Amino acid sequence: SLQPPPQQLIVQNKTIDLPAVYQLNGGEEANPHAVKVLKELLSGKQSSKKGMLISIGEKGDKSVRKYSRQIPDHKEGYYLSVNEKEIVLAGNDERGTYYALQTFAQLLKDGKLPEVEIKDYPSVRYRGVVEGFYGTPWSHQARLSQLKFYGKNKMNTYIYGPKDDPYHSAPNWRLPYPDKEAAQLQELVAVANENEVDFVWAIHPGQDIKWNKEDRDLLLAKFEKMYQLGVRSFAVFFDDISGEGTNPQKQAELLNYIDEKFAQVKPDINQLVMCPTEYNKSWSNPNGNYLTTLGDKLNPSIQIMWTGDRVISDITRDGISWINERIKRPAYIWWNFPVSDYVRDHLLLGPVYGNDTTIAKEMSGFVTNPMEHAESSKIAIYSVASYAWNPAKYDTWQTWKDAIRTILPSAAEELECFAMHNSDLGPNGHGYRREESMDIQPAAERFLKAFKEGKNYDKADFETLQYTFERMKESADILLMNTENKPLIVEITPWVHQFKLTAEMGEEVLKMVEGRNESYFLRKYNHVKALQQQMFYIDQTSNQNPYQPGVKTATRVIKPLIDRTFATVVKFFNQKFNAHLDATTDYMPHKMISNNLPLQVKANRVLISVEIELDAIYPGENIQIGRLEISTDGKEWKTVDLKSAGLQKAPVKFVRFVLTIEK
Numbered sequence: 001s002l003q004p005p006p007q008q009l010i011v012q013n014k015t016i017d018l019p020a021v022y023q024l025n026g027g028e029e030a031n032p033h034a035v036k037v038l039k040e041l042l043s044g045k046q047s048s049k050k051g052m053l054i055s056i057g058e059k060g061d062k063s064v065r066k067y068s069r070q071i072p073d074h075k076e077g078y079y080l081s082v083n084e085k086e087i088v089l090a091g092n093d094e095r096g097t098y099y100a101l102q103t104f105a106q107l108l109k110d111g112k113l114p115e116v117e118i119k120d121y122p123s124v125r126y127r128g129v130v131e132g133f134y135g136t137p138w139s140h141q142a143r144l145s146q147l148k149f150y151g152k153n154k155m156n157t158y159i160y161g162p163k164d165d166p167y168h169s170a171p172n173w174r175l176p177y178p179d180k181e182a183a184q185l186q187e188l189v190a191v192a193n194e195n196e197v198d199f200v201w202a203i204h205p206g207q208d209i210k211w212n213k214e215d216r217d218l219l220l221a222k223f224e225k226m227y228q229l230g231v232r233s234f235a236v237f238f239d240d241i242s243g244e245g246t247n248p249q250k251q252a253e254l255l256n257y258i259d260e261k262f263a264q265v266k267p268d269i270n271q272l273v274m275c276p277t278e279y280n281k282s283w284s285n286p287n288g289n290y291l292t293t294l295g296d297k298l299n300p301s302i303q304i305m306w307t308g309d310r311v312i313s314d315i316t317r318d319g320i321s322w323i324n325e326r327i328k329r330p331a332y333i334w335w336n337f338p339v340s341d342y343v344r345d346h347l348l349l350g351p352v353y354g355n356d357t358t359i360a361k362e363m364s365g366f367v368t369n370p371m372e373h374a375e376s377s378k379i380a381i382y383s384v385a386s387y388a389w390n391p392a393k394y395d396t397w398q399t400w401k402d403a404i405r406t407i408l409p410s411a412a413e414e415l416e417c418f419a420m421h422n423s424d425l426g427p428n429g430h431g432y433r434r435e436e437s438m439d440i441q442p443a444a445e446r447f448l449k450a451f452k453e454g455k456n457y458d459k460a461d462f463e464t465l466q467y468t469f470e471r472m473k474e475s476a477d478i479l480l481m482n483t484e485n486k487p488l489i490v491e492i493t494p495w496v497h498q499f500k501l502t503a504e505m506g507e508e509v510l511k512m513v514e515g516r517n518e519s520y521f522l523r524k525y526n527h528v529k530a531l532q533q534q535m536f537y538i539d540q541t542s543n544q545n546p547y548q549p550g551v552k553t554a555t556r557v558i559k560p561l562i563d564r565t566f567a568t569v570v571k572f573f574n575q576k577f578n579a580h581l582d583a584t585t586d587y588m589p590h591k592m593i594s595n596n597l598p599l600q601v602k603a604n605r606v607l608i609s610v611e612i613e614l615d616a617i618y619p620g621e622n623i624q625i626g627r628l629e630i631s632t633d634g635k636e637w638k639t640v641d642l643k644s645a646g647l648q649k650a651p652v653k654f655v656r657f658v659l660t661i662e663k
């Protein structure tokens with residue numbers, strides 16, 4: 001399974017051994033990066049003018065002048081051939097030769113190559129990743145790993161633009177990077193070049209830029225500094241800003257100035273890209289004409305980025321046609337998946353889908369904006385690389401599975417199981433959702449409805465859920481201890497813990513359904529309650545970011561199933577034995593009674609999704625949003641004036657909608 005799949009491929013049953021004795025032709029002429037790969041593959045073998053001939057080089061080189069008619073005439077294209085006599089590795093250009101070797105490495109199996117003939121090239125000119133999310137920027141080591149990953153999957157673009165990098169955005173975009181960061185960026189560019197990736201440094205000056213000579217010159221000075229560090233591609237982002245920086249005329253004038261006074265003056269600058277303020281259709285204002293102004297004034301060689309019909313959306317034919325009409329050029333797609341900086345309590349490990357597969361000529365580029373979890377994002381990145389190179393042959397599920405098997409060969413099935421139930425985003429402001437747990441969804445839906453109505457559920461459906469919960473535990477435990485991709489495991493470990501707890505809770509609830517005698521049911525009930533508390537603990541101690549703290553997993557299908565199944569069987573138990581067991585599905589140490597919604601704890605905040613009772617006395621900070629008071633014993637009370645009032649560290653245990661307290 002070659003990924004990306006080549007444009008043209010012909011194979012037949014013939015096994016060629018990786019020759020013990022080879023003759024390299026064009027090792028001096030070909031792309032040095034491609035040669036280094038070939039020599040690592042050919043290491044151990046003998047090099048001489050005897051044995052099998054191996055021709056490598058670019059179109060025009062002496063080594064492959066013979067096969068020049070087979071070499072596709074596209075950028076980054078190449079021709080690859082293997083048979084009993086000769087191996088050919090000829091690129092249309094140097095990057096093409098490199099890509100020929102990346103395919104060749106996939107063909108090599110047990111030192112045996114298939115008799116194949118390949119003519120290949122990308123359908124989309126620029127393909128890769130934009131690190132453009134809010135949150136903790138990728139570590140240096142993560143980025144180094146990413147760049148090698150891009151090379152292997154023929155992604156030629158990495159756009160550096162972490163929103164929370166102070167030297168990328170306001171106010172310190174005017175300042176050069178410190179020596180430490182500068183040295184690191186320098187290395188990244190070098191490693192990017194070694195993997196045939198264009199390192200595109202982006203700048204985000206819009207929020208506080210003044211349209212004068214001072215800021216213009218400082219921007220160019222900053223660009224000049226990056227150039228000295230080795231950067232040869234550049235970008236200017238005007239996304240998520242207000243004020244004068246949103247002026248389309250001024251944006252275009254600035255980019256054209258950069259183009260003519262810097263990009264065209266330098267001898268070796270490649271990509272020049274801008275992200276508009278109106279970067280999707282829904283945010284595009286029809287009463288004005290921001291986009292058509294950019295389209296007309298911005299020099300045509302300059303790329304304009306676009307996220308689709310919405311901030312989070314999949315690219316359609318009518319969608320790309322709509323934007324292209326206005327910007328007078330093929331849009332440079334910025335796809336906001338698997339970025340999760342607005343649902344930071346979720347991992348988005350599902351397959352890549354939704355994007356039209358016939359519109360390759362309608363886009364100048366396609367890059368993905370990923371999670372701040374770098375390794376975890378490789379599932380989607382690997383898939384986008386496949387899609388972008390050969391959209392006509394893009395296989396959603398096969399590529400997903402191939403990605404997982406590549407990222408974690410030693411535990412691919414376990415990672416599949418985990419990712420299968422960690423793909424949906426849950427409710428969010430963008431209304432963007434993904435499928436999850438569709439394998440077991442039908443059995444869960446039938447089981448629960450039959451259980452609710454008091455009908456007999458299918459034995460098969462019950463056993464499916466049992467198998468699933470069991471498999472989830474195996475996967476969670478094996479993943480925790482996996483040492484093949486340690487950085488990956490560090491990223492997902494909190495979710496894996498929550499994942500196992502979900503599975504354990506699921507098992508115990510099904511036993512409550514199966515349960516015959518009373519004391520056994522009660523044992524299971526108490527165990528579930530304890531597991532709920534454990535999930536609460538993880539939710540409060542892991543991933544404690546300011547926006548969506550905590551750890552959520554298997555939210556679309558499985559947790560609702562377990563919660564509703566637990567509530568129902570407890571309800572039936574109370575009816576039967578005249579008991580009054582609590583059917584609460586999520587642990588909450590605090591309480592709230594009123595003239596009624598579930599409470600939630602987020603960081604040092606207690607909130608309603610009336611009287612609240614905390615599990616202890618804390619110093620109060622404020623109460624942001626019958627009377628309004630506070631108390632420590634629930635007998636004596638103390639009123640506060642809402643001016644959303646302050647508490648001034650006053651001891652509080654009762655409150656009569658968010659309460660903030662001190663640690």
Ligand SMILES: CCCCCN1[C@H](CO)[C@@H](O)[C@H](O)[C@@H]1CC(=O)NC
Pocket residue numbers: 132133134163239240275279305306307311334336339340341342369
């Ligand atoms: C509604 C404003 C937030 C939109 C921000 N989106 C992403 C969603 O988190 C974020 O990662 C990034 O800054 C992006 C901006 C954007 O869409 N650029 C083309």
